[model samples]
Structures are given as structure tokens and as C-alpha cells.
Target: KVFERCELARTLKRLGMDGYRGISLANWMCLAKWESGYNTRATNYNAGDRSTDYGIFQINSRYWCNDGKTPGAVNACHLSCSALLQDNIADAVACAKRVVRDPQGIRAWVAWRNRCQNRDVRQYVQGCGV
Candidate 1:
């Protein structure tokens, strides 16, 4: 499902994404904007590495979740890659939390580096009533 900007902002905040691991709610919103366009079912397959990015935050199958097809992938988030694509975003939110539980923090997502890092993202949540 594609979420309107503020809708996703409010949802992510309610799921403990705001200030999660020192990452702001707006940053998370920004990541979702650039990663999967706030679409829950978004998927990007990378034949180059035999991996795929799934869900709004674009959690990759390589190190975060297992897709049963990625070569030697690990499930650091302890979830199935399919879980990330559900219309219900609870699982995806939890997995995103797990992803930031490391030194890389939000940097674990390459899109965050390119789109959200050091970027002013407060506009993503502006007037959202979040």
C-alpha cells in the first residue's frame, strides 16, 4: 500500500520509529520516501548480489532478513523477507528497529545515506499532526 507522507509519519512515530537509535522521525520518513516511496509492498531485486530490498524502509535480504534465495544471507532481524512486504507494517517497523541496533545505526540503509543523512527532513513530517 502506498502511504501518504503524513500518514506514514504518524504510523512510524506510533511504532517507536521517532528518535529510534538516535534517528529522527523525519529521517525515517525521508528514508521511506526515497527507499520505497512509502509503499509497503515495494521490492527491489538485485541480481548483482542475489539480494532484494523489501518494504517501506527497504530492508535488504542480504543481512537483515532471509528470503531463502539470497546466497549466504543472514537474518539479523530474525524475520522472513516476506514479512516486510505485508500491508500491516508492524513487522517491518520491528525489523527496522533491529537494523539500527548497531554502530551503523540508520546508515545500514544506503538510501538513508544518500537521501536522509545530513539532510533536513522535518518537512517530511510537517503539518502531519504527528
Candidate 2:
């Protein structure tokens, strides 16, 4: 967990998302936990064939490796071996923040919050608490 925390802290700082005196660490860590459990190699098996969902934040493969236009593939993103092996967490966090800064993130969080309010969702949603 110490390694995870350090990785997250470093990424957050690099992205300049640690605003207001680094209060976003908890938020970033919570989001990471909820998204991919801090596993840089986490892949959504639901997608089938295990394409390449890499990073502690799990920014889908398409974002990085799409027909070689972007980074594409796990190895390309540096998720081959190292524990927190995504070559640039700042890039990953920036991509995530792009979505997070959008209505999709807000709507998703609101839905999760509403489900929690109605007890439809589990404690994990509340754990994130948006």
C-alpha cells in the first residue's frame, strides 16, 4: 500500500491535480481503488481477448494503442513488468482527468451516489463517495 500511495502521489503531483495543498491524494487514491485496485495491469475481461487495459487507473487500451496512432498495447504503455509500470502516470492521470472533468464522471458518480442512497449499491460506492 505504501508503494501504491507513493505512485499515486507522484502521478497526482506530476499532473498538477494535487491542488489546494494536495487534498486530491485521497480522492485520487479512492478513484484508483474503485477503478482498478491500483493494479497497473488490470484488464476488463468483459471486453474479451484481454486487449490491453493498463495502468493503476486503467485507462482503456483504445486511448493508448489504437492502430498505432496512439501508444496502444500494454508493452507500449510500459505495463510489461515493473510493479507500477505504466511509463507515464501523468499521461494516464491526464486522460482520466479529461473524462473525470466531464459530465460522464459526474453522472456516473451521481448514479453511484443515488444507488448508495437507496442501498442498491454496496459499500464500495460509498467508499468512493465521489
Candidate 3:
């Protein structure tokens, strides 16, 4: 979490977003807690459809590698995993920053958070010191 946080902080700072200083880390942590229970290895299980997702952030396999066009472009799951392993918390924060930077990004992150946040997932738990 420490290394990822630092990496995310530096990355966002470069983007002039400074998400670490705002609701970025807090909101991201909340989502991570709820989405995957802070589990970097978490995956979705289905019997019939056999669909799957990966990482602490629970990024869909399609988003990681594919251009969102071809049917299963690349298994960039390794890339996402590396990013998560860099720091699950940091990875979450970085992903959150991306969402907020994009058009209608706040809504995107909020929708995910709203689905995940709960008593078990405390907000502002991380990077409040920043």
C-alpha cells in the first residue's frame, strides 16, 4: 500500500490532479474494500457464463488488454496485476484518478463506490493525513 500510494501520489501530482490530497485515496480505498475485500487475488465465480475479472481493483479482463474492440485483445491481466502488486491501495487510487480525469469521471467512480461502500468499507480511512 505504501509504495503504491507513493507511486500514485507522484503520478497524480504530475497530472496536476493531486488526487492523493483530495477524496482520491479515501474513495478508492472504500471501493477496493467493498469490491474485492482488499483482496488482490479476488475473482468472480460463475457456473454457466464463466466470466471473470481480476486484481484489487476488480478491473474487467477486457479493459486491461483489449482496445475494448477485439474479442479478447490481450491478457493484460499481468499488467493490471503488476500495478496492483505495486500497491493495491495505490493502484486503486491511480485507477480512481483516471476515472475522475476522464469525462463524467466523478460519476463513474461514484457509481462504483456507491455499489461497494458499506460499514465494512470506511471512507477516508487512508491518506487522510495528506
Candidate 4:
């Protein structure tokens, strides 16, 4: 599902993402924009590492989720990678939050920092609790 920007903004705010682990809603906007463009079905496989990134937050197979293949996966999120692709986004959102609880916090996603860090991402949506 490709969520319109404000819809996603509202969705995240209602789902307790506004300041989950010190991550603001606008910061989440930036992360989603850079990571998956608000698309629920987005998936990226890292061939070199034999791992995959799944869903809107692109939770990783090796770290946050389990694909039943990624070696050394602790599956800290305790969910199937397949669950991350669900259109509901509830599981994906939870898994994303789970990942952030680690020592790295939101910096878990290299993409999150590379593009979303210290930038103006507020315009992605019009004042919908950004």
C-alpha cells in the first residue's frame, strides 16, 4: 500500500510513533520516506549478506526479523519476515519499534541516517501532527 503522506502521518501518530523511543513523528516521516516511500510491500534483498529488508520500515532479516534463512538471526522482533509485508502495517510498525530499542536506537537503519538525519522533512506532509 502506498500511503498518501498525511495519511501516514496520522497513522503513525495514532499508533504511538510520535515519540516512540525519542523518535518524533516528522522523523518517522523522514525514515519512511527514505526507507520505503510509505509502501507497505517494499522489500530489498542484500545479496552480499544474504539478508532481506522487509516492509515499510525495511526491518532486516538478519536483525529484526526472520526469513528462515539468514544465518545467526536472533529474530529479535519475534515475527516472520512475511508478516512485515502485511497491508495492515501494525506488525511492521511494532517490529520497527522493537528494532529501535536496541543500543543503536533509530540509527539501526543506515538509510535512516544517510538521508533523514538533520534534514527538513516536514514538507512531506501538511501539518497532520507531523
Q: What is the lDDT of residue 16 in candidate 1?
A: 87
Q: Write the per-residue lDDT of candidate 3 for residues 44-99, one digit (tens) a residue.
A: 53344333455566654444422233354454333443454443344544554554
Provide the lowest-lDDT 10-residue window in model 4. 121-130
Candidate lDDT (C-alpha), each: 0.90, 0.47, 0.47, 0.86
Global local distance difference test of model 3: 0.47
Write candidate 4's Cα lDDT for 1-130 as tens digits: 9988899988888888888999888888888988998998999989999999998988889987889998888788899999999888888889988988888999988887898888886676666655
Q: How many clashes (backbone N, Cα, C below 3 Å) per candidate? A: 0, 2, 0, 0
Report the CA-based lDDT of candidate 4 relative to the real structure: 0.86
User: Tens digits of per-residue lDDT for model 2 on 19-127?
Assistant: 4232345555555665667666565532454444445655555433332322334333332223233545655665555545544552333322443323422233233
Give me the displacement of residue 16 in model 4, in angstroms: 0.3
Q: Give Cα distance to truth, residue 115, candidate 3, Å.
A: 4.1
Q: Model 2 — TM-score against the truth?
A: 0.49
Q: Which residue runs of candidate 2 sit more than 4 Å off their true CA positions? A: 19-23, 48-53, 61-85, 106-130
TM-scores, each model vs. reference: 0.96, 0.49, 0.49, 0.94
Per-residue accuracy of model 1 over 1-130 as CA lDDT, tens digit each:
9999988888888898889888889888988999999999999999899999999888999999989999999999899999999988999999989888988988878888888888788799999988
Who is ahead in lDDT, 3 or 4?
A: 4
Error of 1 at 14 (Å): 1.0
